[PDB]
Write a protein that binds this ligand. Sequence first.
Ligand SMILES: CC(C)(C)c1ccc(C2=CC=CN3CCS(=O)(=O)N=C23)cc1
Ligand SMILES: N[C@@H](CCC(=O)O)C(=O)O
Ligand SMILES: N[C@@H](CCC(=O)O)C(=O)O
Lengths: 258, 258
Amino acid sequence: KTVVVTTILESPYVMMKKNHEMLEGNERYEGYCVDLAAEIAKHCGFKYKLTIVGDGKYGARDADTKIWNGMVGELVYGKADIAIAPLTITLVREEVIDFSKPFMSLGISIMIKKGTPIESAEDLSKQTEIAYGTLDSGSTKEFFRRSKIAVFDKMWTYMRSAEPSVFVRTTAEGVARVRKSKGKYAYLLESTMNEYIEQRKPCDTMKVGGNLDSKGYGIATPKGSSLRNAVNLAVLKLNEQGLLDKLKNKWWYDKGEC
Amino acid sequence: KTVVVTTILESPYVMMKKNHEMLEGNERYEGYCVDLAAEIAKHCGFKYKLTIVGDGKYGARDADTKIWNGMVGELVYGKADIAIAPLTITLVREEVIDFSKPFMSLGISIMIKKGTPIESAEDLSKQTEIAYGTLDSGSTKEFFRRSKIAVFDKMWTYMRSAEPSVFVRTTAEGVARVRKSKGKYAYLLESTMNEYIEQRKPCDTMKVGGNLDSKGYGIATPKGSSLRNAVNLAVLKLNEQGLLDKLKNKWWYDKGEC
Ligand SMILES: CC(C)(C)c1ccc(C2=CC=CN3CCS(=O)(=O)N=C23)cc1
Ligand SMILES: N[C@@H](CCC(=O)O)C(=O)O
Ligand SMILES: N[C@@H](CCC(=O)O)C(=O)O
């Protein structure tokens, strides 16, 4: 049986090939997670179909309806068999889906337009001239909503009521808002994506300060999946071979434009 | 029932208190993993007994007998219920025990005596004047034994036949060898331990170069354990609260002395 993979268009994890219009099926896509999916499938002995999550989201439980959206919802409601994506391992997600051991580390980080007078989360929290926000329906927004740490809770109180809205629907939208806001918007996003974007033309953004937390991305399966064990061992093998490190270098720094 | 915890004397994870002779049971010990054990036990609702692994080893399958030693052996053969220690998550261990998601990240790293003319693994591999080695019966030795990467395989070929032996029984022994060898021994160990020792008097050692790999420590349970799920969720909760970060700062840098 074909394993249905849910994933998300997020550079450099999954991207449309320039010539995608000329291609069919899995061959339309390229990136770190496209390469990882091929390796996991080879090691576990399955055939698969890459599908892009219909709503373009990572996944959160909707405030009103209590229904999971994004890739998490695709797994919870039986629409996909596995998620191979930069999907953060969290407690509330582990209650409803399984994760492999992590394939990549990350932490929440700050993106600024170059020259913005901000060095830290504390700096952001102590001012309002420079607006700041996060992606909707993902782990970064939930980090601020749940944090008991004074600085991060102060940031949440500001973000949740800021006008106009500081939240964005996609990473690309956060990046565009940093680039177009003349230093007046800073974006909170994962260090992996921040570091990729810092390498991309026109190299007008950068990561500042330390990471706010430390966590990982994992390959997720629905509870009860027969794939769980083999997928986990395959991630460990690919790490131990240095293949995950090779893929990070390939997609972050061999594509590097500054 | 009392949960029997296997752990290892490895600073700053588990250390004898200065006044341990005056104390009984769990109260004899202090450190990051002592604090972590108390938190995991509280969150999972169990009472526990800290025990120090009899052979002082992390764990490997003996070449001759194929019997697991160290903390891994304590779990495999039913002597302990859980390992709470800086125990690296590896494929061959995941086949025989379970691990939580990681509670800390690390990579293999190089420790030198200050002023040693070495900056990288490649530098070590291209010379023999400065001897270099690893801990026995752990994940670092196995990394070199199994590596297909040219520089690391060259290092393995040298280490496995070097005279006198470059391998040590405990981290303390590797550190002592670096300190007493006047620059003529470099020690390959995890970045966590390397960074701790760089802060300790007399501040005569340091970490050089990048990490050789990227991996994690996990809390381990024997296959079939009823503790597996609750332990994993407790690690995720402690991470999400910032408690793991607080404990790292407590044991590495709040008592650090350079
Ligand atoms: C949550 C923290 C503690 C920050 C963490 C620790 C380690 C990793 C990790 C990164 C890359 C590869 N691997 C291999 C599987 S692993 O050993 O389970 N962990 C990793 C990620 C996050
Ligand atoms: N990796 C995140 C999405 C990005 C973010 O929230 O910053 C998730 O799995 O929700
Ligand atoms: N953490 C390692 C021990 C230290 C090392 O091998 O450098 C293990 O679990 O085997």
